[model samples]
Target: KLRYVSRGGLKLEKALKEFHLEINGKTCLDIGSSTGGFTDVMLQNGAKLVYALDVGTNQLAWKIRSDERVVVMEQFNFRNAVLADFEQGRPSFTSIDVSFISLDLILPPLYEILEKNGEVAALIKPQFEAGREQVGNGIIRDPKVHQMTIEKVLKTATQLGFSVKGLTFSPIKGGAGNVEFLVHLLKDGKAEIAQQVNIESVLQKESE
Candidate 1:
């Protein structure tokens, strides 16, 4: 049986394996850590420490909060935090799973604070990225919008000196059945598979 406090851990397990991330003995951060699902996954994977940060307070699971290696950063907004804000933790790896805001906003600040050559596993929700008018009844149904949102995030991260390492659809969709994606990126490298990555191809696989 899987050792995790929440189902969110399952998403991370697939992402980590596909992205080839090494979490063991590294300082890590989990943004938008509701219930500490991603944090739980990192802990089980042997992360030395994890900063479980969230915009709202008291959403993290009690079991994860009780762990010594995990640092609770509840009620802290990542958008407003400065580089020096996360004292005592220089994260080499970070996972982002935010809602209601654009991933475009998250990548820039993250690039600044990450250790040299740091890596990231971002859960991109096209749900929150598209135009308000585009999404009907809380669902972004158009494939173009999904491509645009994903492309925007890719441009944002690559411009910040992070190379695109991998990309894939989440095994499970968002709670409301909106499609989501997982991106793996690394700092300060020539972009890998940038031209080869095909959005329609990925989406085509999803539809079949």
Candidate 2:
């Protein structure tokens, strides 16, 4: 068997190809880098460095933990994190795959810290964003619920001065079998944006 760091790395590996993103020689920030999944992907894809930040402690894989190129920010909350928290240097790209917290809580602060023109691939979980009644047994099964959650998140990103550049569904389900979305955000304020993404179509396609 080949040596690998974390299973989360596999998700990023797929996203990199599906999203057509280039991480080579770029500095990346892995929010919710729990178990170092995304961190491993970034490194394997030729990323120069990765700042793996998470609220949990000691969950990073040993391989990444020992790598000099990986900077661990353990026991840190992303919502309250500021520029000073990122001493390893600002990342040009970020991957957010957080849970228990909505993207609404974390995007603003991250936007302030990311480099100008930086890109972010944010994982929007419906479980955290949908109305309580829409969630059943920790899963949001209704496609409409997924649509509404995505629209709400996209609206919030717009208000934060980010342009939603791309949108897609995660290739896999969340821990509870809830559908999730990956949204690409560009930090630039000058880009012409579509007022909103057609969430219904996206949800339909995703559910199919």
Candidate 3:
């Protein structure tokens, strides 16, 4: 209703604001782009180019699909994506909103493609990251499970040489009503300006 192609746009919008991130003149990759929500945000924030990559086809909104700044790449799995694939420009920033797979699969490959010092804003959906037994009816209702899921992802990213820059819960719930989080990562060394993420505090806020 706000004119965004999808609600996912609002999700990234909040992340950018909370993380103090900027995309002006940067080339970006939107993995699991779906209806081009993240792609639209990237463009609106002055991204020079955006590779809207997704596993499915014909799902991107026509408004975004027709934009000259967007490079639609449907049926392209991020796991199999390579640096050479982005001939328009090497992505300096990336946004990931994937499902049905662990962030583990996407992060490693993404590391290889992004330019040095590049950054990523990823959405961590606990319903997908948590153990099957920990999730009920496609939702992770326990705060402990949420903490475990976030820790797993943070550990994985740290091991891959990404520095955690910022972390916060999504401003909105997932389509299935699951709580989600946004994590800002830098490809360089540890971010000196990085703030510690208190899962307990975040959970408390979520509860309120």
Write down the TM-score of every candidate.
Answer: 0.94, 0.91, 0.95
| Number of the predicted model whose TM-score against the real structure is largest | 3
Which is better, 1 or 3, measured by lDDT?
3
Question: What are the per-residue Cα lDDT tens digits for candidate 1 across 20-121?
Answer: 899999999898999888999999899999998888895878888889998888888888877798787799999998999998888888888888889899
10 residues in a row with least lDDT, candidate 1 = 189-198
Candidate ranking (TM-score, best to worst): 3, 1, 2
Candidate 1 residue pairs in backbone clash: none
**Between candidates 1 and 2, which one is better according to TM-score?**
1
For candidate 2, write residues 69-180 as lDDT tens digits. 9988888888888888777678889999888888889889988988898888888999999877777779888777787898889888888998887777887888888778
Per-residue lDDT of 98 in model 1: 90
Q: Give the worst 10-residue stretch by lDDT in candidate 3.
A: 189-198
**lDDT ranking from best to worst?**
3, 1, 2
Candidate 1 TM-score to native: 0.94
